[PDB]
Design a protein around this ligand. Structure first.
Ligand SMILES: *[C@@H]1O[C@H](CO)[C@@H](O[C@@H]2O[C@H](CO)[C@@H](O[C@@H]3O[C@H](CO[C@H]4O[C@H](CO)[C@@H](O)[C@H](O)[C@@H]4O[C@@H]4O[C@H](CO)[C@@H](O[C@@H]5O[C@H](CO)[C@H](O)[C@H](O)[C@H]5O)[C@H](O)[C@H]4NC(C)=O)[C@@H](O)[C@H](O)[C@@H]3O)[C@H](O)[C@H]2NC(C)=O)[C@H](O)[C@H]1NC(C)=O
Ligand SMILES: *[C@@H]1O[C@H](CO[C@@H]2O[C@@H](C)[C@@H](O)[C@@H](O)[C@@H]2O)[C@@H](O[C@@H]2O[C@H](CO)[C@@H](O[C@@H]3O[C@H](CO)[C@@H](O)[C@H](O)[C@@H]3O)[C@H](O)[C@H]2NC(C)=O)[C@H](O)[C@H]1NC(C)=O
Ligand SMILES: *[C@@H]1O[C@H](CO)[C@@H](O)[C@H](O)[C@H]1NC(C)=O
Ligand SMILES: *[C@@H]1O[C@H](CO)[C@@H](O)[C@H](O)[C@H]1NC(C)=O
Lengths: 53, 130
């Protein structure tokens, strides 16, 4: 109930659902760290453009 | 209104250089990728150069490629073209034309660029003095 109450004043993100275009490799130095646990390729870091009203 | 004024052009000789300055007013020049065009005696229009909103990329005709270099100045709200190795065939009136308004239109909805930039790649709506 308190979580819903704190959720109420938050602004909605419904218009964000439009289709976007993202790029995985970006202008940064490190992409493969010292450790590899099937997560270096799954970097979960992309930079993405999106239309907003 | 949105006005553009060219200057710096004058009589020159081949092999030298030239600085054509296109000042602008009446709008936010910080993101308006301008277009340098030329018109020779007894000839039609001929596109010279084009620069993006941010100056990242730029396009020059293969004939005029290398001889001219285009640049922008958002602080001055000005555009600049520096020549090099001028040729007698370059005799022309040079104009500085704007891009297709601020946003790009589609289905009555207008899109501005990143950081709300005035971008397009379309016809040239406004033309300068020359
Ligand atoms: C995420 O990864 C992606 C995948 O790599 C990134 O995207 C792009 O991928 C491409 C895959 O093929 C990469 O291609 C490589 O590009 C190499 C560099 O080529 C340029 O530089 C060499 C010199 O090192 C040059 O010989 C090449 O021709 C090219 O530059 C030339 O530059 C001149 C001068 O600026 C251009 O001349 C233009 O001429 C016209 C008139 O005709 C106007 O006057 C212009 O003003 C003028 O500039 C010339 O046109 C241009 N050449 C070409 C063909 O356009 C190359 O050596 C490799 O073999 C390979 O082809 C590409 O580099 C890569 N993008 C980047 C930015 O690296 C993606 O970018 C990345 N994500 C992020 C965020 O970066
Ligand atoms: C993913 O990111 C690239 C690179 O963007 C650059 O690096 C990021 C980490 C951020 O720091 C960005 O702020 C930064 O621009 C996007 O590609 C484009 O790269 C060019 C590099 O030549 C950027 O050019 C800049 O343009 C400004 C304004 O015109 C100039 O003042 C600068 O001097 C420089 O030339 C360009 O801005 C950048 N594009 C964008 C939209 O930021 C790539 O587009 C992006 N991926 C997606 C999907 O947008
Ligand atoms: C990455 O950082 C190293 C130093 O830690 C430096 O030598 C190298 O040039 C950097 N590479 C890039 C692409 O920034
Ligand atoms: C990285 O991968 C190799 C083989 O895929 C594995 O032997 C090694 O343990 C991995 N690195 C780590 C930190 O587990």
């Amino acid at each position: 109930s308190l979580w819903d109450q704190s959720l109420k004043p938050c602004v909605q993100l419904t218009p964000l659902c439009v289709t976007l275009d993202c790029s995985y490799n970006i202008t940064n130095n490190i992409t493969n760290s010292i450790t590899n646990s099937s997560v270096n390729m799954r970097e979960e870091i992309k930079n993405c453009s999106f239309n907003m009203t | 209104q949105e006005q553009l004024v060219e200057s710096g052009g004058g009589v020159v000789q081949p092999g030298g250089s030239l600085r054509l300055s296109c000042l602008a007013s009446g709008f936010t020049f910080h993101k308006y990728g301008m277009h340098w065009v030329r018109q020779a005696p007894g000839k039609g229009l001929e596109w010279v150069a084009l620069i993006s909103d941010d100056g990242m990329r730029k396009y020059h005709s293969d004939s005029m490629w290398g001889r001219v270099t285009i640049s922008r100045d958002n602080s001055k709200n000005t555009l600049y073209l520096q020549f090099s190795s001028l040729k007698v065939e370059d005799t022309a009136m040079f104009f500085c034309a704007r891009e297709a308004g601020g946003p790009i239109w589609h289905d009555d909805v207008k899109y501005y660029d990143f950081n709300d930039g005035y971008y397009n790649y379309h016809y040239m709506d406004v033309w300068g003095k020359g």
